[PDB]
């Protein structure tokens, strides 16, 4: 007999006028529903579905769905979950369904095709080319030969007049083919595709720079869903200068003013031209077919033309390359000309491109390709070539080599800093820990979002404004807020926004502190290749900038968990924009601050003035928590789960790197085979993510990152001291967590930092302890506790319980939400005003700062600017979090502290 | 006896905040006042511009300078007879010192200012030299690169001459050259300059008007144009030595080498806000001992680059040193284009190009600021820009002689012909400034300055004044309506001003050879201007419209109109004209690229677009040198024939034997040309006005006149007969509508008014008829004459008959003027004078438009609205039935 239950997904902004099939996650209660005996149905007014992670005890805990393209797009869809006790118990009978589109795959010694209904792509199982030919469902080709470019140079010239006695030698590469898969479903097929960048012209080099691009196909689709990383393993000598992808645009058959070139302007304009230009010709053809041109129709045969026009084609030139530019955030150039050998002619150009260009013909069809974000990726470009020949190019470059080269070289030289004692007075006045070759991007990563849209004739310009708007805002469907919060699939420190005016302008204040973040990405221009999606550390009120140049005060890096501040504010409200820039953020944070690559996979890279250039490199920014709410919300982003699994290796790193090293007063270091030390608090706080994470997916490695778990957090209940014990040793081998160097025999250490709560340890304790349940060893949720209540205890119940006072702690306001905690966990409401105080009356923010923002203008600053000089980074991320746990757990006890 | 008047002016726009000393013109009537003899009083220097023929004086110029004290009238008094920079001169260079700044110009050598001083005596700026990069070969895309290795060859401007027009108020110094190699492909030198410096009494800024003419291959391909001065700043502590940008709308950018804002620890609230406004802070004792010691640890920002590629996009950046990455510096859209280099004790230099951002592609760089002496670049044309392609746009598409050529002009509107697809001899004035300072001033000074030189402001007469002097024409008159249909008509030429103005923004009219012009057509279709099809892109002045635009500004007086003027005879006198070579004094015919088109022609370079600009300004010396390039223009005819390939004989031009003139499409701009260097007396007056004067009386005997076709053109006897196919006279009578409307009634009314009695035979007759005749009945082209005419711009050549109709006193004519204007082609009364907007897909970028007009139709719509009301109002009332 039956279990059902139904739960609503809802278009994260206005119903969209289009799309082109989509995947979304729901949560379900612990112990609800058994995998692979549950079934899922779809209502949408008047459904394709997988496991994503599971509970402790086996059940569902967050599934993946996916629909097909269709024209019929509803204000809400509802999925119903039927066990199977509900179809055997019957003597009723269903109708046999029957999709009107359905994809069909055809595995290959060769090749591999996907059929979408409308769409056919073959994907070759090795070699220099990504895509063989893509078809119409007519049978006909549209593009092919989709390949990826890449190009680099040895050198790059110390300044423009040095050119004359430094030569540039370049370099061209063909991305190389070496892995295949499929994940095929009625409704969608993922092909992954895994390889290299291969030499093929210019000077020979190792094959490097690997990729792996995703393509998403869906049921009754011709928008092809691509995500396109590389992890960048480059040295001192390789140095990007175009990065792209490429398709071959057929056009053989098609009469020159019959062949369509598109690009995409601002603000949802089109730009209109064929490779013929009959419009505006010192003679008229006539009216109609002036028009029709305009519109992307063939044209009428050519004796039915006012034959002033028709006899002189021939003097009507033939414009075979068109070139958009996107160098700068705020300016495009676009240029065309009639072959390789001539000038280009400037076409008048604009601000801001919406980064789409399509090549096809009213007969032969064609294609339109774009980045998601163009603009704000500079420097981007989109290239069309030969036009007016019997093979056309169209290309995306990601990497425009019209700009300057990607330089990923440190920044300074060192300044003289020689030794460990240098490097931490260096950081007294700077803010940034440097250590030689550390300064490094060896194993950063950076993904982006491109979509393919094939054709069977030249669409209409109002279908490619449309499907340029689609691509840089595609949309989504996500849970209902108030359900994500039932089913506690995704934390219980977090609620939804209660009737107390203190607690209503603490919303207010979130609100300011994102309207303002929001803001002030365009204000400062956060945008850029690798730099979209990141934001600052600290503000320099003097010059009115943000310390982009004072080592650590500048790229923020995750620093302070703003990642968990960003995704909780949106899992409480359901705004668009508060995913569309957390997206951003797990974007830019998961890939280009995280060495994926070397004996640094795991790490990432704390606060620099690069992403790469601070030598501490900790498990802190990595983080998989930070990752795990857009991992499910989403439907499991492959690439997201791609790079939780990466980190599973973490661990091994402390064999390698001691963050301590600098610091740490026990003369210890790490030696093979031996243990390793880290953290018990901000290192383990990801270590410990990452593998509830793989228990939960039942990855490959969940049954070794659910040991390590269990054993960790054992040891830790283990240790004496527990959380205040400063920082135990591990053995990779048996995988157990002893005590500290200068503790071996549990006579418990302190070691006191601010920082140790403040990077996700409340999260993943919480819930690793709800997922440990019964089987949590003992004494861990008490060695917790104490953490949680001494951190802000008196000094004399510091030193009754520790032996010594914890003379460095800071970031009160940031730890008012571990009393909240202990508070709720303890049904304590002394210990919950202890919050509500540490909130509103210790550090970070403060009721009476001036919330609000100032404007700059005139002779100070380059650009108007609004700032709010009384706020950092670390100030908003601690108290965005402290709003919404001490909310979570102790609202009942804010208005009895206010009163 | 005494002869004695006034006469005032008045500030362009609104009063100035600021000027730099300033020059101005001012007209004076005939027969008023004698050079060399009548004094001038402000409440001053003064000098000659141009001279009536009785040689009174017609035109003059003044300087001023620089002050603290601005009014808002200057007021300028000649008195009849009746009634302080200094210049030192060692063998070697020679040096200008104004009170401020003191600036060494070497005679020769790669180095052209050797160094500037203030005051003090303390060198601020040195080695001001110009920089050029030239590379062989462009690749053609961009996989292309390591299969085709590319040569970079750098240069810098030789000196060969150094001229110096010095005064009281005001020195000019003028310094010819050429760019010579240093290190690259041992190349002969190349691309001519002038580069004239503007210092007036009491000011520390300086006018800078860099000219350049490109002589050069299909290979020489132009990397980066710069202007490059060493900043000295040696004992100046790196905390103490300052950098700024000019950002958007009034912004400064404001670092230091060595940031002591931001930090991680607080030196001191005081100390800090000293950094940021540009002063030396106080000693390291009074220092917080924490961010005092540990400086060393601190960071130096040694380069800085402000690329300005596009006309809506800058960028900005930093480098410890070369050899380490850049770090992108927060930026934004249009940089106005200054930068500043010095220190708090050892001063420095500013440099700015006026129209920075719409000059594009420019950068401004400062290099070596941690080093003992550091480099400030203004790059004319940005190394990071792809490099210059002055190539042709087509490979001739399989044009082989003159049948073709023709054909694909009914099409594409282009006249083609191989070897013309070149832009050997066109050049390009750069307006920049350099600015002197004693400490690094305040950054409210510096946006003072940027915006100082980004809209330069400008003394101009009263409007009322110059039409009663008759120094410029008698054929406009003051907008003063009393009609209800006159002020429409006004409306009218408001709205064609302002839709044009607005074009520029909207259709991104900007960059290094291509800011100043318009575009010649509209493609409805499309909606865009026809950037693409030969002759209905780049506009090069067809039909005249530098001649209504300065009229415009003539009768109005409006900032904006002289401002737009300005910018399109910047760009027309130079990019469009040829300026050396066997073309010399043609100027290339409106096409796709300035120097597309293969029909070079003197209706395009004609002298009298540039007059008005001339004599107003007090004879800029950029464009007294351009007029007189233009006396050169007759040289070529034995050179090249403009109606070759449209000819029937066999004909074919050597020099110094005969050639023909279309006496409108040839002659007006010849005679205009004459006409100025006569009015000028200039190296060439005496010549001028025999050829000028010749010409005029070899047409008033040719039995029918201007009404006959083109003339017979003796280059040895400077004389003009009947035409081939009418030698002996009888009477010749051959009528294009395109010789009334490239200058011809506005040289003629001048020359006229200039000769007076001195006008030979009935040439006065000899015009009139013309424009009595050109819209007659047929049967009136019969009784005269006797070949009724073949009648083509109508409302265009109502402005001739009006002309006549004031002259005669004749108002059956007048009427007729008006019925052209109101009733025949052009533009007409009831069309639709609106702007519509258009934006979706239907475009790149939203954009307003009529394609119900174009470039021709609003030239001569404006010249003949300005020229009916001028001649003929009375009439308008009378007209209306
Ligand atoms: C192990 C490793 O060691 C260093 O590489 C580095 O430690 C330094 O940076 C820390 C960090 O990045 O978070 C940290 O900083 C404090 O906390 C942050 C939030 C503040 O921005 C800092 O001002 C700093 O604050 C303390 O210092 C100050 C101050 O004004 O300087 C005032 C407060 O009262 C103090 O709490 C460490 O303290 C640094 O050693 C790595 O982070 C670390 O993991
Ligand atoms: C003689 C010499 O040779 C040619 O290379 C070239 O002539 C051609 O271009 C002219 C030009 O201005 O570029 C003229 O076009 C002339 O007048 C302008 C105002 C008009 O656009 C034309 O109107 C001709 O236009 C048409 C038409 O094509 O439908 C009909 C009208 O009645 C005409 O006014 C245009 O003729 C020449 O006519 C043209 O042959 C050089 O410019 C020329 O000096
Ligand atoms: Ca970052
Ligand atoms: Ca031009």
């Not at 003097?315 to 072959?339: E, S």
């Not at 509830?692 to 957090?713: F, H, S, V």
């Not at 100030?875 to 502290?897: E, F, K, M, P, R």
Request: proline residues 5%.
């Amino acid at each position: 007999n039956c279990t059902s239950s139904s739960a609503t997904v809802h278009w994260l902004g206005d119903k969209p006028t289009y799309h082109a099939g989509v995947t979304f996650g729901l949560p379900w209660p612990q112990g609800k529903y058994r995998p692979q005996e549950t079934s899922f149905s779809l209502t949408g007014d008047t459904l394709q579905s997988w496991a994503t992670g599971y509970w402790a005890d086996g059940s569902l805990k967050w599934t993946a769905h996916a629909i097909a393209e269709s024209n019929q797009i509803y204000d809400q869809y509802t999925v119903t979950a039927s066990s199977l006790g509900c179809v055997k118990s019957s003597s009723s009978s269903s109708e046999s369904s029957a999709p009107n589109s359905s994809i069909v795959v055809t595995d290959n010694s060769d090749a591999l095709t996907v059929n979408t209904g409308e769409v056919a792509v073959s994907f070759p199982k090795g070699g220099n080319v990504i895509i063989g030919d893509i078809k119409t469902k007519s049978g006909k080709v549209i593009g092919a030969n989709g390949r990826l470019v890449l190009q680099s140079q040895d050198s790059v010239p110390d300044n423009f007049d040095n050119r004359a006695n430094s030569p540039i030698q370049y370099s061209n590469f063909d991305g190389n083919i070496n892995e295949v898969f499929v994940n095929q479903t009625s409704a969608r097929t993922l092909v992954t595709v895994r390889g290299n960048h291969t030499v093929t012209d210019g000077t020979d080099h190792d094959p490097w720079l690997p990729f792996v691009v995703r393509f998403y196909l869906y049921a009754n689709s011709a928008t092809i869903k691509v995500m396109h990383s590389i992890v960048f393993d480059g040295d001192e000598n390789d140095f990007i200068t175009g990065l792209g992808i490429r398709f071959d645009v057929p056009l053989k058959g098609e009469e020159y003013y019959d062949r369509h070139i598109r690009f995409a302007g601002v603000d949802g304009g089109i730009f209109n031209e064929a490779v013929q230009g009959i419009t505006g010709l010192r003679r008229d053809p006539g009216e109609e077919i002036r028009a029709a041109q305009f519109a992307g129709q063939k044209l009428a045969d050519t004796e039915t033309w006012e034959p002033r026009v028709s006899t002189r084609l021939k003097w009507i030139p033939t414009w075979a390359d068109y070139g958009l530019t996107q160098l700068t955030a705020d300016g495009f150039g676009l240029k065309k000309r009639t072959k390789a050998g001539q000038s280009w002619v400037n076409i008048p150009s604009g601000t801001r491109a919406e980064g789409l260009a399509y090549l096809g013909g009213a007969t032969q069809g064609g294609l339109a390709v774009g980045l998601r974000d163009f603009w704000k990726r500079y420097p981007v470009g989109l290239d069309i070539s030969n036009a007016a020949s019997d093979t056309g190019e169209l290309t995306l470059w990601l990497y425009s080599p019209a700009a300057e080269p990607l330089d990923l070289r440190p920044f300074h030289d060192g300044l003289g800093q020689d030794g460990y004692e240098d490097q931490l007075d260096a950081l007294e006045i700077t803010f940034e820990d440097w250590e030689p070759g550390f300064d490094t991007p060896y194993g950063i990563a950076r993904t982006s979002e491109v979509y393919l849209f094939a054709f069977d004739q030249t669409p209409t310009s109002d279908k490619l404004a449309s499907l340029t708007a689609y691509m840089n805002d595609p949309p989504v469907l996500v849970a209902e807020p108030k359900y994500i919060h039932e089913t506690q699939a995704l934390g219980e420190y977090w609620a939804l926004p209660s009737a107390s005016p203190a607690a209503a302008t603490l919303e207010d204040r979130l609100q300011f502190i994102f309207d303002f973040y929001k803001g002030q990405i365009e204000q400062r221009r956060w945008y850029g290749f690798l730099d979209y999606g990141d934001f600052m550390h600290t503000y320099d009120p003097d010059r009115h900038t943000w310390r982009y140049d004072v080592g650590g005060y500048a790229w923020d890096n995750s620093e302070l968990s703003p990642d968990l501040f960003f995704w909780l504010y949106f899992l409480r409200t359901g705004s668009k924009d508060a995913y569309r820039f957390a997206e951003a953020l797990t974007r830019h944070t998961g890939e280009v601050d995280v060495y994926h690559i070397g004996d640094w996979k795991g790490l990432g890279t704390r606060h620099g003035v690069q992403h790469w250039s601070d030598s501490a490199k900790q498990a802190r920014i990595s983080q998989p928590q930070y990752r795990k709410y857009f991992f499910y919300l989403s439907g499991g982003d492959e690439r997201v789960g791609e790079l939780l699994e990466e980190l599973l290796d973490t661990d091994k790193t402390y064999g390698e790197l001691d963050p301590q090293r600098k610091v740490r007063t026990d003369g210890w270091e790490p030696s093979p085979n031996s243990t390793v030390s880290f953290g018990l608090g901000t290192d383990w706080s990801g270590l410990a993510a990452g593998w509830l994470i793989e228990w939960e997916r039942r990855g490959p490695r969940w049954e070794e990152a659910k040991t390590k778990l269990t054993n960790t957090i054992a040891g830790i209940a283990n240790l004496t001291n527990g959380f205040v014990t400063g920082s135990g040793l591990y053995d990779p081998v048996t995988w157990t967590l002893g005590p500290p160097p200068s503790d071996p025999g549990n006579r418990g250490n302190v070691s006191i930092s601010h920082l140790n709560a403040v990077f996700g340890l409340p999260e993943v304790v919480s819930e690793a302890i709800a997922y440990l349940a019964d089987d949590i060893p003992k004494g861990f949720k008490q060695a917790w506790l104490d953490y949680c209540y001494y951190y802000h205890a008196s000094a004399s119940e510091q030193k009754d319980r520790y032996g010594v006072s914890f003379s460095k702690i800071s970031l009160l306001q940031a730890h008012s939400r571990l009393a909240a905690y202990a508070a709720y966990e303890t049904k304590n409401k002394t210990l919950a005003l202890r919050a509500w105080k540490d909130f509103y009356a210790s550090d970070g923010l403060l009721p009476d700062a001036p919330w609000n923002i100032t404007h700059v203008d005139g002779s100070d600053v380059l650009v108007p600017v609004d700032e709010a000089a009384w706020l950092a980074t670390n100030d908003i991320a601690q108290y965005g979090l402290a709003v919404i746990q001490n909310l979570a757990y102790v609202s009942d006890s804010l208005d009895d502290y206010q009163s």
